[PDB]
Each structure stands twice: as C-alpha cells, then as structure tokens.
Amino acid sequence: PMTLGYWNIRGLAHSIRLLLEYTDSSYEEKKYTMGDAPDYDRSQWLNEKFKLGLDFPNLPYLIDGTHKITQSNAILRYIARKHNLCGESEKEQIREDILENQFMDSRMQLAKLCYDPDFEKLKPEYLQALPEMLKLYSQFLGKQPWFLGDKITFVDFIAYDVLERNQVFEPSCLDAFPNLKDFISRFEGLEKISAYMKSSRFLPRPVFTKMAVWGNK
Amino acid sequence: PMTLGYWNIRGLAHSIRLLLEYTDSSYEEKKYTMGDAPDYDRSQWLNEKFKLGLDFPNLPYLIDGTHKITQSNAILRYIARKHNLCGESEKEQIREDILENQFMDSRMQLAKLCYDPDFEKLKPEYLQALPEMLKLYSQFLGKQPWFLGDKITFVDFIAYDVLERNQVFEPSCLDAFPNLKDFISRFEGLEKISAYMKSSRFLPRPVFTKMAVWGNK
Ligand SMILES: CSC[C@H](NC(=O)CC[C@H](N)C(=O)O)C(=O)NCC(=O)O
Ligand SMILES: CSC[C@H](NC(=O)CC[C@H](N)C(=O)O)C(=O)NCC(=O)O
Numbered sequence A, B: 001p002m003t004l005g006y007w008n009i010r011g012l013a014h015s016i017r018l019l020l021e022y023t024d025s026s027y028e029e030k031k032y033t034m035g036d037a038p039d040y041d042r043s044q045w046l047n048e049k050f051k052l053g054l055d056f057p058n059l060p061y062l063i064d065g066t067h068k069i070t071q072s073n074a075i076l077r078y079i080a081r082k083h084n085l086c087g088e089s090e091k092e093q094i095r096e097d098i099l100e101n102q103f104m105d106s107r108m109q110l111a112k113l114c115y116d117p118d119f120e121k122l123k124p125e126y127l128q129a130l131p132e133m134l135k136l137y138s139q140f141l142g143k144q145p146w147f148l149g150d151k152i153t154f155v156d157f158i159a160y161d162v163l164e165r166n167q168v169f170e171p172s173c174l175d176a177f178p179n180l181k182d183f184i185s186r187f188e189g190l191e192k193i194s195a196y197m198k199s200s201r202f203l204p205r206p207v208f209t210k211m212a213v214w215g216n217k
Helices: A014-022 A043-048 A072-082 A090-114 A119-141 A154-169 A178-188 A191-197 B014-022 B043-048 B072-082 B090-115 B119-141 B154-169 B178-188 B191-197
Strands: A002-007 A027-032 A061-064 A067-070 B002-007 B027-032 B061-064 B067-070
Touching: A002 A014, A014 A072, A014 A154, A014 A191, A061 A072, A067 A072, A067 B090, A072 A154, A072 B090, A090 A119, A090 A154, A090 B067, A090 B072, A119 A154, A119 A178, A154 A178, A178 A191, B002 B014, B014 B072, B014 B154, B014 B191, B061 B072, B067 B072, B072 B154, B090 B119, B090 B154, B119 B154, B119 B178, B154 B178, B178 B191
Parallel strands: A002 A027, B002 B027
Antiparallel strands: A002 A061, A061 A067, B002 B061, B061 B067
C-alpha cells in the first residue's frame, strides 16, 4: 500500500485523501500529531523527518514504493496521472494550471487569516472580498459539471476542498452561486466519496493545525 | 506578439521573461508602475485590471491571442509546452511537480521576510536556515546539468530565479555548493540568455515591489 504522511488534520491532505478514495487506491495513513500550546511540539515528525528518504522532507508526503513525493500538488498530479484524471488538451491543461495555482492562492488567503493573531480584526475584510473570489470561480465553471468540463480531474478535488472549507468558514458564502453549491453536491454525491464521507476515516476537522486561531479544533 | 503584463520589477516575471527570450518568443511587455509611499498607488493596474478579459485578473499575465493566462507557473508551463521544455517521463514529471512547488515555497520565504516590518530581527534566522535549503537543492541536482537531467526544462528557469536572487540577498550563499554555482554559470552562459542579459530589456532589479523592506529599489 501507498503511505500518506501528514498531520492529524484536514489541512493539505484533504484533496489527496479524497482523490485516493475516489481512485480506489490501496493506501494507509502515517498520522503525525502536533503537541499542544505552549510547546506545539513537533517531534513525532521531526524525529523521522530526515529518515524517510524524501528529497525535500515535508508534510504531506506520499510513499509509493520507489516513488517518494512531497508537495501536495505534486502528490495530486502523481495520482491523477495514474488514473487518467488529468487535462488532456491544451485548453484543458491551461485551465488546469491556472486553477491549481489560483486555488492555492485562495487556500492560502484563508490560512493567512486564520493563523493571524489579528484574526478578529482581519475577518471582515476577508468576508468583503469573499463574494468576488467565489464569483470568478462560478463564472469559470459556468454550466459544466467539472472545472475542466465533462470529465472530472484532479483540480476538482482541490476545488472541492477550498470551496467547501470556505462554506465551513462562512456557511452562507455559496448561496449567491448555485452552480458552486451544485458542484459541492455533485462531488459529495460521488459513489466512493459519499461512502468515504460516511466512514470512520473521513477527517473534515480540524481544518488547520493547533497553532491556528480559527479551526485549530 | 504575445503580451506579458507585470509590475516594472523582477518579481515573478523574471523566469517568464527569461523563458520567452530563451525560446525566441515574439513578445512585448505591458509594464505597470506602482506609486511611491505613502500611496503605493496601484491605479495603473487597477483601472484596466478587469478589462483584459482574464478569468482571474492578476499580475503577471500573458496574452497570446485566444489564450489569456494568469498565475506565473501556468504561464511558464504554457510556454514550456509550446517549445518542448517539459518533463516527459513519469520520473521527470514527478521531479518537475515537486520542484515547481518547492521553489515556490522557497521564493515565498524570501518574500515573506523582505516584506516583513521586522526584517532586521528576522533576517538572521532566515540566513540560519539558508544553507539547509540550498543543500537539498544541491543534492537533488547532483551532477546533472539541469534539474530534470540532460535536457533543460521550465523548472530550470524557476530554479535560476530563486537561487540567483538568494545570491543577490546573501552573496556568499552558494559558495559551499559548487554545482549550484555552476548551474548559475551554465544558465547565464546560454547563448540567448547571455545576449538578453547584456541587453537594455534585462531587469534584475528591483527584486520586489516598492512596499518591500529589502529590494524595493
Ligand atoms: C500546514 S501544512 C504543514 C507544513 N507543510 C507545508 O507547508 C507544505 C506546503 C506545501 N506547499 C505543499 O503543498 O505540500 C509542514 O508541517 N511541513 C513540514 C515541516 O515544516 O517540516
Ligand atoms: C508581488 S507579485 C504581484 C501580485 N501578484 C501575485 O501575488 C500573483 C501571485 C501568483 N501566485 C502567481 O504566481 O502569479 C499582484 O500585484 N497581483 C494582482 C493584484 O493583486 O491585483
């Protein structure tokens, strides 16, 4: 079985976990636990960090026998290639590359906020900009079932994580955007995703690490 | 001709500029200028930000006729595909995806620091970590001329920007790492790269925007 190493949270493994489940991948999780405050003791990871034979040791990581992979997008692409869940044409590849990076910027905006000591002061401005961020995603998806079009690919798994987690942050945020709401349902309704989400494994919380101001538990 | 839009700085356009020059691409630059302090007035960009027909308006952008591309990695991949400067095999693609995301983490570390108000206090800790960062890049490159092996690809262009800019931040940083120094020379010695670097277009500073503590000019 493949090994997926990450913190015992949602974080950056969510899309990877879902993709692994969707693709019916044989895998098990190496789950590291961060200590509490004031420590935020990381030693579980730190001890074996340099022992896994990763070129750029990091969480998350994927071990698939010969292949040892860090960087969450690289893991996602790796698995997506293995199961034909990639953009094929130029137009699709362009769309894929734009989305992967754009979603990453959006992911990180929410993380920057929720780790910021000034969370309470900063929250409103983020919610001001929130509709415009969703609007661009909505326009882009249009009437298509999936972000690259007819066929589901890896970005849809990124898409879901970042869009859904906004909906856990601000529950009403997708209300203006019916196609994004339908996207969420489509995704969660997928036979394997649905089965997973009802299983003991599913790990939708905590969103962030114990160091977070919001979503630490 | 393609249009490359960005601020009148090095920033995230460097690798793109160099790739466009290397590939002998027909291109011209739409250069936006940020105001000074206290304003940092952005209105040059802001006015026509929503008028270029980009799905996710952003700097940098590439307009290639039908194709309008934002996100710097997306732009790089776009041009790389057009000129066969991509990882072909699985092992290459894995390496490419790892490196693109890793370098981007590294890039952002320097940017976080150089935009931080506590730049002076924070600088030493970054320089503490700096050798280990370089070491992992060095090990990964090994004896190969380019990061993916025999043939140069797009990551090399990212590689150059982030590694070189560290050498502008701390000039001695590559001294313990001869293969990285040779990488820099190999890259700078490429016929078209060399010609470009000696031309009037070449824009190696400022490193960051006027809002930066380090490398604003
Ligand atoms: C909050 S996510 C946990 C964090 N990992 C990253 O930041 C990886 C980000 C990377 N860009 C990726 O996408 O994999 C981490 O603990 N990394 C290992 C480390 O710092 O030693
Ligand atoms: C300091 S670079 C300038 C900054 N752009 C980005 O942060 C884009 C980053 C994106 N991840 C990319 O790589 O293109 C910017 O001015 N963006 C347009 C805007 O904010 O309106």
